[PDB]
Enzyme design. Structure first.
Site, short mmCIF file in Angstrom:
data_model
loop_
_atom_site.label_atom_id
_atom_site.label_comp_id
_atom_site.label_asym_id
_atom_site.label_seq_id
_atom_site.Cartn_x
_atom_site.Cartn_y
_atom_site.Cartn_z
N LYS A 74 0.85 -1.18 0.00
CA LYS A 74 0.00 0.00 0.00
C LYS A 74 0.89 1.23 0.00
CE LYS A 74 -3.67 -2.73 2.11
NZ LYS A 74 -4.32 -3.08 0.83
N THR A 125 8.42 -19.49 -2.25
CA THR A 125 9.42 -18.72 -2.95
C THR A 125 9.53 -17.35 -2.28
OG1 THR A 125 9.04 -19.96 -5.01
CG2 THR A 125 10.15 -17.86 -5.24
C1 LIG Z 1 5.53 -29.16 -4.44
C2 LIG Z 1 5.30 -27.71 -4.12
N1 LIG Z 1 4.05 -27.24 -4.12
C3 LIG Z 1 3.82 -25.94 -3.86
C4 LIG Z 1 4.82 -25.03 -3.55
C5 LIG Z 1 4.50 -23.60 -3.25
O1 LIG Z 1 4.88 -22.75 -4.38
P1 LIG Z 1 5.29 -21.16 -4.17
O2 LIG Z 1 6.76 -21.20 -3.82
O3 LIG Z 1 4.97 -20.48 -5.54
O4 LIG Z 1 4.44 -20.64 -2.98
C6 LIG Z 1 6.15 -25.51 -3.54
C7 LIG Z 1 7.29 -24.59 -3.19
N2 LIG Z 1 8.63 -25.25 -3.19
C8 LIG Z 1 9.09 -25.71 -1.87
C9 LIG Z 1 10.07 -26.88 -1.95
O5 LIG Z 1 10.74 -27.02 -3.00
O6 LIG Z 1 10.15 -27.60 -0.94
C10 LIG Z 1 6.38 -26.87 -3.82
O7 LIG Z 1 7.65 -27.40 -3.79
C1 LIG Z 2 -6.75 -4.52 7.03
C2 LIG Z 2 -5.98 -5.45 6.13
N1 LIG Z 2 -5.16 -6.33 6.70
C3 LIG Z 2 -4.46 -7.18 5.93
C4 LIG Z 2 -4.54 -7.21 4.54
C5 LIG Z 2 -3.68 -8.17 3.77
O1 LIG Z 2 -2.41 -7.51 3.43
P1 LIG Z 2 -1.81 -7.72 1.94
O2 LIG Z 2 -2.67 -6.78 1.06
O3 LIG Z 2 -0.31 -7.32 1.97
O4 LIG Z 2 -2.05 -9.22 1.59
C6 LIG Z 2 -5.41 -6.29 3.90
C7 LIG Z 2 -5.50 -6.24 2.33
N2 LIG Z 2 -6.82 -5.93 1.77
C8 LIG Z 2 -7.08 -4.48 1.57
C9 LIG Z 2 -8.51 -4.05 1.93
O5 LIG Z 2 -9.08 -4.69 2.87
O6 LIG Z 2 -9.04 -3.08 1.28
C10 LIG Z 2 -6.14 -5.41 4.72
O7 LIG Z 2 -7.00 -4.46 4.21
#
Ligand SMILES: Cc1ncc(COP(=O)(O)O)c(CNCC(=O)O)c1O
Ligand SMILES: Cc1ncc(COP(=O)(O)O)c(CNCC(=O)O)c1O
EC number: 2.3.1.37
Lengths: 468, 472
Positions: free
Chosen positions: A269, A299
């Site tokens: 934000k 990641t």
């Molecule tokens: C099998 C598998 N599924 C889902 C995710 C989650 O993806 P993001 O990183 O985009 O959140 C991972 C991440 N990899 C973790 C590892 O290699 O142990 C994964 O290895």
């Molecule tokens: C009060 C509040 N807390 C936590 C989050 C989650 O943070 P991230 O956006 O970084 O995931 C939001 C996001 N939503 C904005 C809204 O309620 O308008 C939020 O509004």
């Protein structure tokens, strides 16, 4: 054949359409070179954005963009791994250090999003203390609600900002029962503000942890944008700059921001990027780092995205003019609306919620604003808010100068007439009804800040990597 | 008097130290201009990274970086809102369209991360079908485990890749019971691969949905990098390019990738960026879009980050040489290790898990590799794997040419002697472990070039999906 999966989904989607909460996203392409304009499908078709959460316009700040460009050239795009494996790095260290500095805490931990931060912290607390009782403000965000469900412990919901009801709930447990008070500083849909200090007092008395979501407050409150907790001891923090003040604003030993156990924010934000974080004691941070699956098994955010947020945080810390000009812009819009009898939910914050009271009328108002007046403001309906309380959310920034405000005011006035919507007078005959930034605070300039806030040499935290 | 919160945390952190799973992260600063090098604290102190999940080296590809630079100039850094409010845009539309095209599905939906995608989809399915029974592979990722817990429904865990046990579990319910089979295509810690086709057959027979995590497969399998599901009908997909094939590889109507109900991936590995997604029917996508709080209530990923991933996906689709050279690099390292008696957990995929067998020795091996040989490889210990099965994970890319491989092989050989670690022969004397004692990419497939792809994959004019914005 088995279960009718397609039938279940069809009827579920049909309920959204019939109850008229089925959402249509707008194609909004925000222009860095022309803030706060955006284009729609065609580049030539521009609108003025009045509902972004880029609260300080830092998404397009030169220091943010420059930090991104340089980081991309050195690091590339992706982190290429998780914090454990090949995705821990200097941009990560600098950002965690910056956030800890901002909140004057021992540590901070960055997550994919504040949604994930909130879920991770709340889940873990409840999963590791099965005896925990969580006391949750009825207007807490979805992320906190979901975190509290996941925590899987006893929970009490108190009426919004009702500290009599909160105290009565706290009182009905022995002190030795572990407790958590979960709340926001600024509630985004109403713009209402918590009495953080009184909540900290209640926590001390009844033996609770405090969990504070400052997502709609970081960048915006306190002399350095550390949030409403900082604003509680505005003058102490302003005098001390980066340092912990000797005393709070009442001459006591501890600031409000110091007394809050866990503070979460977003990088998505005010800080003009993406991501979430929690700031807290070294011990708490090390615990989340070591145990939170939503931290561990995902990641790492791109280095460039972290570099951007770091640059945004550093810049805004020593540019109080960002906040003073935002507040002025907001106050200008609010007072113009008051004069025209355009009904605004009264609040002491930077949010301007215009009350419509009807789902269909709010969507049509939004529709007319964008198509006829080239004004982008989004309708807020159930389930984000109670049915009957539907509204348009307007969020002025330092970039919304009075000429743009004048166009907005004129357009909203015009739309109220076109739809024959109720004015304030009409609401009085028939709901949801006084400023955090004072005149004194609003006349401060960057010269009135402690010089120690300009390019601090912020050192990296040991806890980010692991403690010996 | 009050609960000892600090005491609970201290003892919790101490369990990590005593069991020796308490992690120290390495300062690794990956260099776009010098892939796969990275520097540590000092710029001058460089190592070669051999355990990144930047599987195709696309994190530093000029078309990825250029897409980012141009997007930043136009859009800035942050999205500036959620998809509902001010954070829905052309980069988002293009990316969702690209992913749907890749998996040849009606729709795709982008999330913050695949962790969030997996959690959102699994949570919602279980929350909206309380009678659902989930059948989950014992080696499913934490994201899926957490999603399945959150779903809050009956779950059965089947022994890893054991489709006899899965069938017996499926069989013990009437067909009309709602069921979900949740699994991965490629399991990252030992490189094992699911029989996606047989699981789809079991789903048909016993009336289950399929949920497939292709996180360690997208970019890497199939002619276009759509994953192992695509690899199942390699020749059909290759002939048809971006179009849906007339027939599957057996002459039937529907491909395996078409028969899978929900496919999740990451943008954070092969695609060189960050983020997650699910690809599925328009109805399912619209449902997640409309109901998943982890989708709805969170800041949209930066436009530049989406633009990067889009560029990476488009590039890799028509560069099969990325996959052939990765497989060759992997095979080179695997066969060199075999010749030297360096024990590799046998698998048909791109991962090279070197068996150590001891937590302390794995960490020391990792330590010596980075400090003495400037090779960065991470030790994998309990609880990520079983005690006694600890290992080093090595993940070659198109950028790990044979000269770099040679250095790795030499260094690992050297470290094995320094620590007197067991070779293959030594494991055989104790009765073997985990197969220390075929291949998805065949010789035929590995001799394909970019000229052997359908020309329709080169610069597809991919159109934006209506479902990304909402359907009337
Ligand atoms: C099998 C598998 N599924 C889902 C995710 C989650 O993806 P993001 O990183 O985009 O959140 C991972 C991440 N990899 C973790 C590892 O290699 O142990 C994964 O290895
Ligand atoms: C009060 C509040 N807390 C936590 C989050 C989650 O943070 P991230 O956006 O970084 O995931 C939001 C996001 N939503 C904005 C809204 O309620 O308008 C939020 O509004």
């Amino acid at each position: 054949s088995g279960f009718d999966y397609e039938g279940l989904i069809d009827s579920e989607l049909q309920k959204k359409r019939l109850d008229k909460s089925y959402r249509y996203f707008n194609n909004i392409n925000r222009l860095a070179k022309e803030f706060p304009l955006a284009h729609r499908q065609r580049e030539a078709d521009k609108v003025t954005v009045w509902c972004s959460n880029d609260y300080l316009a830092l998404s397009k700040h030169p220091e943010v963009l420059d930090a991104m460009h340089k980081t991309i050239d050195k690091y590339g795009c992706g982190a290429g791994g998780t914090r454990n494996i090949a995705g821990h790095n200097i941009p990560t260290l600098n950002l965690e250090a910056e956030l800890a500095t901002l909140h004057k805490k021992e540590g901070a931990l960055v997550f994919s999003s504040c949604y994930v931060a909130n879920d991770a912290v709340l889940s873990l607390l409840g999963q590791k203390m099965k005896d925990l009782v969580i006391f949750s403000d009825e207007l807490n965000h979805a992320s906190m609600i979901v975190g509290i469900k996941h925590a899987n412990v006893k929970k009490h919901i108190f009426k919004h900002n009702d500290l009599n009801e909160l105290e009565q709930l706290l009182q009905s447990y022995p002190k030795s029962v572990p407790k958590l008070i979960a709340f926001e500083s600024v509630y985004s849909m109403a713009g209402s503000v918590a009495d953080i200090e009184k909540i900290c007092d209640l926590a001390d008395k009844y033996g609770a942890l405090t969990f504070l979501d400052e997502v709609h407050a970081v960048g915006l409150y306190g002399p350095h944008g550390a949030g409403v907790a900082e604003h509680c001891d505005f003058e102490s923090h302003r005098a001390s700059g980066i340092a912990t003040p000797k005393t709070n604003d009442k001459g006591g030993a501890k600031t409000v921001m110091d007394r809050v156990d866990m503070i979460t924010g977003t990088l998505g934000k005010s800080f003009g990027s993406v991501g979430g974080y929690v700031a807290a004691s070294r011990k708490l941070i090390d615990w989340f780092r070591s145990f939170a699956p939503g931290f561990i098994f995902t990641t790492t955010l791109p280095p460039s995205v972290m570099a951007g947020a770091t640059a945004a945080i550093r810049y805004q810390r020593c540019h109080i003019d960002l906040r003073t000009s935002q507040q002025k812009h907001t106050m200008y819009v609010k007072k113009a609306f008051h004069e025209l009898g355009i009904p605004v939910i009264p609040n002491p914050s930077h949010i301007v919620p215009v009350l419509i009271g009807n789902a269909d009328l709010a969507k049509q108002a939004s529709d007319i604003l964008i198509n006829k007046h080239q004004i982008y403001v989004q309708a807020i309906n159930f389930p984000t808010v109670a049915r009957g309380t539907e509204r348009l959310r307007i969020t002025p920034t330092p970039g919304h100068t009075n000429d743009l405000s004048d166009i907005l005011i004129n357009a909203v006035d015009d739309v109220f007439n076109e739809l024959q919507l109720p004015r304030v007078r009409d609401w009085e005959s028939q709901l949801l009804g006084s400023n955090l930034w004072t005149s004194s605070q609003l006349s401060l300039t960057n010269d009135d800040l402690n010089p120690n806030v300009r390019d601090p040499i912020v050192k990296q935290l040991e806890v980010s990597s692991g403690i010996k």
